[PDB]
Amino acid sequence: AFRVLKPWWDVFTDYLSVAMLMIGVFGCTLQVMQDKIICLPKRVEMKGLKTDLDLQQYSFINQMCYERALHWYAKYFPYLVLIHTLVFMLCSNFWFKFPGSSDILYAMYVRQTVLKVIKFLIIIAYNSALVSKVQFTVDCNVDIQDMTGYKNFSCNHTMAHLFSKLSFCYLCFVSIYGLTCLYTLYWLFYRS
Amino acid sequence: KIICLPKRVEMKGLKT
Amino acid sequence: DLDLQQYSFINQMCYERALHWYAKYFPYLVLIHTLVFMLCSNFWFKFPGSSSKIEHFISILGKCFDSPWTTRALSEQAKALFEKVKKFRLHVE
Amino acid sequence: DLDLQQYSFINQMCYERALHWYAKYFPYLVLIHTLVFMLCSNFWFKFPGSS
Amino acid sequence: RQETGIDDIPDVKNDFAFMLHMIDQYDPLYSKRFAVFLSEVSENKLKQLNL
């Protein structure tokens, strides 16, 4: 009812989904507290380089360039991972959450496996390009003059590199999950 | 927190 | 003569670049490795194929030790348990 | 005329250099001693062979 | 076999032998009690008792 319906590949998929869920929530929190862009006006014995910008202007610049520069995928990566893991969990548990299904069962399971495989394929295909997109440093040329007087700004994102680190490992996890499904897919198309 | 600044005005800061 | 924003920016940059990665990841690294140890220890029981044999052996050994007829022989209902004993001996051999 | 950053830097440096290690590590040392103690005491029950 | 004078229970397969070694490491008396049910003469006697 709860345990016998878990083959070893199913247990592996469930545990991988659990681990990637904990990764996703961890990233979401890290965004919650430490995700803060930090910006400075770019274009200018050694002395200081005082820019006579009071605190409020620094905050406004931070937010303006944080929206303008930092990539949307870079911003939403933790949300992305969390949403994908919730979708994986829900599509795994829908086999028993469906009131009717509590040979159409086999077709529903095949459809769920195909959905998981396609999700893995799409995730890999777009993450391959997107992972390199996030950068630690960043440059924004935003017309903020008449408000600070500067126009070219260099910023850096606190979690960026950290995220990329985690992101890289995340990629591998996805492949593994797909491979597991692949085996199950083979079990669905080699033995019938 | 709507963050606000005054608007109408090598470069330096714009100490207000 | 450096404002606060410059100081925080300097902290962020020099933290990412200068400070070595091992210092930045040592606790998570150790945590990962101890998880690997715990998982490799637990997989000996989390693998159902051998887990069935292990659990059946636990049950049969507990029943056989609990049987007072064993000690009596050392000097009733266990007759039915003899069949389970022989079946387990043959199968898990 | 030292900005706050220099004060924190001085605090941390003189913390690591001057202040003796006993003050820094005394609580953690106490934790390790206590954990060794109650583990050794409980090992009488935790050892299955005599359990 | 030398203790209870029972010549049955000669040996066991690889799995049983290793897992018996594990049990002995845990508790030899558990091995002693578990061995009894392999004795064929014991089964004959207990079948006679049931009869």
Numbering used by the authors:
A (entry chain G): 16 to 59, 95 to 152, 256 to 345
B (entry chain A): 51 to 59, 95 to 101
C (entry chain F): 102 to 176, 236 to 253
D (entry chain E): 102 to 152
E (entry chain F): 355 to 405
How do the authors describe this structure?
Volume-regulated anion channels (VRACs) constitute a diverse family of ion channels that are ubiquitously expressed in mammalian cells. They are believed to be essential for maintaining cellular volume, as they are known to open in response to hypotonic stress, enabling efflux of anions and osmolytes, thereby preventing excessive cell swelling and burst. VRACs are hexamers composed of five closely related paralogues of the leucine-rich repeat-containing protein 8 family (termed LRRC8A to E). In contrast, when expressed on its own, the LRRC8C subunit forms a larger, heptameric assembly with weaker mutual subunit interactions and a different preferential arrangement of the LRRDs.
Previous studies of the structure of homomeric LRRC8C revealed its assembly as heptamer, which is larger than the hexameric organization of other characterized LRRC8 subunits and their heteromeric assemblies. Differences to WT become evident upon comparison of maps of LRRC8CV390L to wild-type LRRC8C homomers processed without application of symmetry. In the case of LRRC8CWT, the entire PDs are well-resolved for six subunits whereas density below the TMD towards the intracellular side is absent in one case.
